[PDB]
């Protein structure tokens, strides 16, 4: 409907709503997975936060070779304040938005959109592994 744009010039004292929404959409197990993904994205971070190189890195793996300008525009476009860099807070809400955004935009008969979120997630996980639970005994 109207929602809320301005921060009310009153930082902190809330933010609980954002966390609550994430919890409702993301489960405890899912939340842990999210953190794991964040750590991977944080790896190689020039400024400690996702950048053109980080985003470009995954693009190369997908077989895509986007220009530096394209990556910069994408970050600025998705950026909350257009700072040009996505921080932990911005990254967290960004992921949540993409989740509900995709759900909202479905209607019927989808179209080949670059890559699917599920496909990317599966690629990150690669081969299934549960040897973590069993260390002394190896069963595969």
Annotated binding site for Ca(2+): 79, 81, 83, 85, 90
Minimum distance between the CB of residue 5 and Ca ion, rounded to whole angstroms?
Answer: 15
Footprint of Ca ion on residues 44-103 (CB under 5 A)? 79-80, 83, 90
Tell me the per-residue interface mask from 111 to 130 with Ca ion, x by CB under 5 A, - otherwise: --------------------
Which residue positions form the known binding site? Answer: 79, 81, 83, 85, 90
- How many of the other CB atoms lie within 10 Å of CB of 38? 15
Q: Which is nearer to Ca ion, 49 or 115 (CB)?
A: 49
Angle at the Cα of 94 (from 90 to 96), degrees rounded to 5? 125
Contact 55, 45 (CB under 8 A): no
Contact 98, 77 (CB under 8 A): no
Please, what's the largest Cα pairwise distance for the chain? 57
Interface residues with Ca ion (CB under 5 A) are 79-80, 83, 90
């Amino acid at each position: 409907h109207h929602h809320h744009h301005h921060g009310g010039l009153v930082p902190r004292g809330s933010m609980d709503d954002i966390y609550k929404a994430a919890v409702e959409q993301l489960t405890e197990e899912q939340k842990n997975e999210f953190k794991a993904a964040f750590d991977i994205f944080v790896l190689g971070a020039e400024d400690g936060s996702i950048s053109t190189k980080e985003l470009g890195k995954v693009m190369r793996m997908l077989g895509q070779n986007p220009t530096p300008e394209e990556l910069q525009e994408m970050i600025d476009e998705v950026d909350e304040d257009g700072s040009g860099t996505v921080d932990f807070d911005e990254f967290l809400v960004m992921m949540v938005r993409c989740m509900k955004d995709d759900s909202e935009n479905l209607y019927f008969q989808g179209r080949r959109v670059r890559i699917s979120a599920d496909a990317m997630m599966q690629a990150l996980l690669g081969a299934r592994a549960k040897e973590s639970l069993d260390l002394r005994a190896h069963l595969k």
